[PDB]
Amino acid sequence: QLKLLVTRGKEQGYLTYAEVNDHLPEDIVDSDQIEDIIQMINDMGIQVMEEAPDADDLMLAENTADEDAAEAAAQVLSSVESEIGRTTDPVRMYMREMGTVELLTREGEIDI
DNA sequence: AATCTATCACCGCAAGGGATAAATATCTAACACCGTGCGTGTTGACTATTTTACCTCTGGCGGTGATAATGGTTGCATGTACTAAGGAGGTTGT
Secondary structure, eight states, X not given: OOHHHHHHHHHHTOOOGGGGTTSOOTTOOOTTTHHHHXXXXXXXXXXOOOSOOSSOGGGGGGSOOSOOOSXXXXXXXXXXXXXXXXXXXXXXXXXXXXXSOSOOGGGHHHHO
Protein backbone atom coordinates (compact mmCIF):
# COMPACT_ATOMS: atom_id res chain seq x y z
CA GLN A 1 0.00 0.00 0.00
CA LEU A 2 2.66 2.61 1.29
CA LYS A 3 2.23 5.43 -1.42
CA LEU A 4 0.10 7.69 0.88
CA LEU A 5 3.00 8.41 3.33
CA VAL A 6 5.86 8.97 0.83
CA THR A 7 3.74 11.03 -1.65
CA ARG A 8 2.22 13.43 0.95
CA GLY A 9 5.67 13.76 2.62
CA LYS A 10 7.28 14.74 -0.75
CA GLU A 11 4.33 17.14 -1.55
CA GLN A 12 4.92 18.72 1.92
CA GLY A 13 8.77 18.71 1.40
CA TYR A 14 8.87 17.50 5.07
CA LEU A 15 7.39 14.61 7.17
CA THR A 16 7.08 14.56 11.01
CA TYR A 17 8.09 11.22 12.68
CA ALA A 18 4.58 10.52 14.16
CA GLU A 19 2.84 11.09 10.73
CA VAL A 20 3.91 7.45 10.03
CA ASN A 21 0.55 6.78 11.84
CA ASP A 22 -1.45 9.72 10.27
CA HIS A 23 -0.66 8.47 6.69
CA LEU A 24 0.14 4.82 7.71
CA PRO A 25 1.39 2.16 5.21
CA GLU A 26 -1.70 -0.14 5.31
CA ASP A 27 0.73 -3.12 5.19
CA ILE A 28 3.17 -3.72 8.13
CA VAL A 29 4.05 -3.11 11.85
CA ASP A 30 7.92 -2.75 12.11
CA SER A 31 8.07 0.01 14.86
CA ASP A 32 11.69 -0.72 16.05
CA GLN A 33 13.01 -0.97 12.41
CA ILE A 34 12.20 2.81 12.05
CA GLU A 35 15.32 4.07 13.96
CA ASP A 36 17.70 3.32 10.99
CA ILE A 37 15.41 3.13 7.85
CA ILE A 38 14.51 6.79 8.74
CA GLN A 39 18.02 7.58 7.27
CA MET A 40 17.10 7.30 3.51
CA ILE A 41 13.69 8.86 4.38
CA ASN A 42 15.68 11.99 5.54
CA ASP A 43 18.70 12.49 3.15
CA MET A 44 15.93 13.11 0.50
CA GLY A 45 13.14 14.38 2.93
CA ILE A 46 14.64 15.56 6.34
CA GLN A 47 12.35 16.54 9.30
CA VAL A 48 12.05 16.15 13.17
CA MET A 49 9.61 17.15 16.03
CA GLU A 50 9.41 19.80 18.91
CA GLU A 51 6.71 22.11 20.55
CA ALA A 52 6.74 25.13 18.10
CA PRO A 53 8.99 27.19 15.69
CA ASP A 54 8.66 31.04 15.32
CA ALA A 55 11.06 31.93 12.38
CA ASP A 56 13.03 28.69 11.68
CA ASP A 57 11.61 27.10 8.43
CA LEU A 58 14.74 27.13 6.15
CA MET A 59 16.52 23.85 7.29
CA LEU A 60 15.87 21.76 4.08
CA ALA A 61 17.96 24.23 1.94
CA GLU A 62 21.43 23.05 3.24
CA ASN A 63 20.71 19.34 4.12
CA THR A 64 18.98 17.41 1.20
CA ALA A 65 19.52 15.56 -2.17
CA ASP A 66 18.58 17.03 -5.61
CA GLU A 67 17.28 14.59 -8.42
CA ASP A 68 15.33 11.53 -6.94
CA ALA A 69 17.07 9.70 -9.84
CA ALA A 70 16.69 5.91 -9.13
CA GLU A 71 17.17 5.30 -5.34
CA ALA A 72 14.33 5.29 -2.69
CA ALA A 73 12.43 6.97 -5.61
CA ALA A 74 12.15 3.45 -7.24
CA GLN A 75 13.70 0.73 -4.94
CA VAL A 76 10.60 1.58 -2.79
CA LEU A 77 8.99 -1.05 -5.09
CA SER A 78 9.95 -3.72 -2.48
CA SER A 79 8.50 -1.65 0.44
CA VAL A 80 5.14 -1.09 -1.45
CA GLU A 81 4.96 -4.65 -2.97
CA SER A 82 5.76 -6.63 0.31
CA GLU A 83 2.13 -7.51 1.40
CA ILE A 84 0.46 -9.11 -1.72
CA GLY A 85 -2.57 -10.76 0.00
CA ARG A 86 -1.21 -14.44 0.14
CA THR A 87 -4.03 -16.02 -2.03
CA THR A 88 -5.49 -13.02 -3.99
CA ASP A 89 -4.90 -12.41 -7.76
CA PRO A 90 -2.42 -10.67 -10.14
CA VAL A 91 -5.37 -8.20 -10.65
CA ARG A 92 -4.30 -6.90 -7.14
CA MET A 93 -0.42 -6.85 -7.27
CA TYR A 94 -0.34 -4.49 -10.32
CA MET A 95 -2.27 -1.92 -8.15
CA ARG A 96 0.67 -1.97 -5.63
CA GLU A 97 3.33 -1.97 -8.40
CA MET A 98 1.65 1.15 -9.98
CA GLY A 99 2.15 2.61 -6.45
CA THR A 100 5.21 4.02 -8.33
CA VAL A 101 3.69 6.04 -11.29
CA GLU A 102 0.51 8.12 -10.77
CA LEU A 103 -0.04 10.10 -14.09
CA LEU A 104 3.25 11.61 -15.54
CA THR A 105 1.24 12.31 -18.80
CA ARG A 106 0.83 15.36 -21.19
CA GLU A 107 4.42 16.74 -20.65
CA GLY A 108 6.27 14.46 -18.14
CA GLU A 109 6.61 11.54 -20.61
CA ILE A 110 7.48 14.19 -23.27
CA ASP A 111 10.36 15.20 -20.89
CA ILE A 112 11.25 11.47 -20.72
C1' DA B 1 -24.97 -116.28 -14.63
C1' DA B 2 -28.13 -119.36 -15.52
C1' DT B 3 -33.55 -120.62 -15.10
C1' DC B 4 -38.61 -119.07 -16.28
C1' DT B 5 -43.77 -117.67 -15.66
C1' DA B 6 -46.68 -114.50 -16.09
C1' DT B 7 -46.64 -109.49 -16.82
C1' DC B 8 -47.97 -105.37 -19.78
C1' DA B 9 -48.43 -105.56 -23.84
C1' DC B 10 -45.47 -106.19 -29.53
C1' DC B 11 -46.09 -108.71 -32.38
C1' DG B 12 -49.27 -111.83 -35.00
C1' DC B 13 -49.90 -111.18 -39.54
C1' DA B 14 -55.33 -108.78 -41.60
C1' DA B 15 -56.22 -104.85 -43.72
C1' DG B 16 -55.68 -100.46 -46.45
C1' DG B 17 -53.70 -95.97 -47.12
C1' DG B 18 -50.13 -92.90 -49.72
C1' DA B 19 -47.09 -92.96 -52.76
C1' DT B 20 -44.32 -92.40 -56.81
C1' DA B 21 -43.42 -93.47 -61.22
C1' DA B 22 -45.00 -94.58 -65.48
C1' DA B 23 -47.05 -92.39 -69.61
C1' DT B 24 -48.85 -88.77 -71.39
C1' DA B 25 -49.15 -83.87 -72.42
C1' DT B 26 -48.20 -79.61 -71.53
C1' DC B 27 -44.95 -75.98 -70.62
C1' DT B 28 -40.56 -73.22 -71.49
C1' DA B 29 -36.08 -72.44 -72.86
C1' DA B 30 -32.04 -72.93 -75.76
C1' DC B 31 -30.66 -72.05 -79.75
C1' DA B 32 -29.87 -70.65 -84.73
C1' DC B 33 -31.02 -67.85 -87.58
C1' DC B 34 -31.52 -62.91 -89.00
C1' DG B 35 -31.12 -57.81 -88.50
C1' DT B 36 -29.70 -53.90 -86.30
C1' DG B 37 -26.42 -50.51 -84.78
C1' DC B 38 -22.50 -49.74 -82.41
C1' DG B 39 -17.76 -48.81 -80.97
C1' DT B 40 -14.70 -52.62 -86.09
C1' DG B 41 -10.67 -49.78 -88.58
C1' DT B 42 -7.73 -45.86 -90.72
C1' DT B 43 -7.54 -41.56 -92.11
C1' DG B 44 -7.90 -36.65 -91.68
C1' DA B 45 -8.98 -31.95 -89.78
C1' DC B 46 -9.96 -30.20 -86.00
C1' DT B 47 -8.97 -27.52 -81.46
C1' DA B 48 -7.28 -26.82 -77.63
C1' DT B 49 -3.63 -32.82 -74.34
C1' DT B 50 0.55 -31.08 -73.06
C1' DT B 51 4.76 -28.50 -73.02
C1' DT B 52 7.45 -24.03 -73.08
C1' DA B 53 7.47 -19.40 -73.79
C1' DC B 54 5.83 -14.93 -72.81
C1' DC B 55 2.84 -11.20 -70.59
C1' DT B 56 1.03 -9.90 -66.84
C1' DC B 57 -3.55 -13.26 -62.43
C1' DT B 58 -3.77 -14.58 -57.44
C1' DG B 59 -2.31 -14.49 -53.25
C1' DG B 60 2.17 -14.92 -50.69
C1' DC B 61 3.22 -11.76 -46.13
C1' DG B 62 5.46 -7.94 -44.57
C1' DG B 63 4.72 -3.88 -42.80
C1' DT B 64 2.67 -0.69 -39.40
C1' DG B 65 -1.56 4.03 -39.28
C1' DA B 66 -1.52 9.90 -35.44
C1' DT B 67 -6.96 16.49 -34.23
C1' DA B 68 -6.77 13.08 -29.97
C1' DA B 69 -7.83 9.10 -27.15
C1' DT B 70 -2.78 8.18 -20.64
C1' DG B 71 -6.58 4.97 -12.25
C1' DG B 72 -8.13 -0.81 -14.73
C1' DT B 73 -11.33 -4.60 -14.23
C1' DT B 74 -13.37 -8.91 -12.09
C1' DG B 75 -17.53 -11.43 -9.76
C1' DC B 76 -18.69 -15.29 -7.02
C1' DA B 77 -13.64 -20.78 -4.75
C1' DT B 78 -17.39 -21.07 -0.11
C1' DG B 79 -20.98 -21.40 3.52
C1' DT B 80 -20.84 -28.23 5.61
C1' DA B 81 -17.91 -31.95 8.76
C1' DC B 82 -14.50 -33.27 10.27
C1' DT B 83 -9.61 -32.17 12.56
C1' DA B 84 -4.39 -31.96 11.98
C1' DA B 85 -1.02 -28.63 11.50
C1' DG B 86 1.30 -24.11 11.72
C1' DG B 87 0.97 -19.91 13.33
C1' DA B 88 0.71 -16.01 16.92
C1' DG B 89 2.35 -13.81 21.80
C1' DG B 90 1.96 -13.09 26.54
C1' DT B 91 3.24 -15.48 30.47
C1' DT B 92 3.75 -18.70 34.32
C1' DG B 93 6.33 -21.55 34.51
C1' DT B 94 10.70 -25.48 32.62
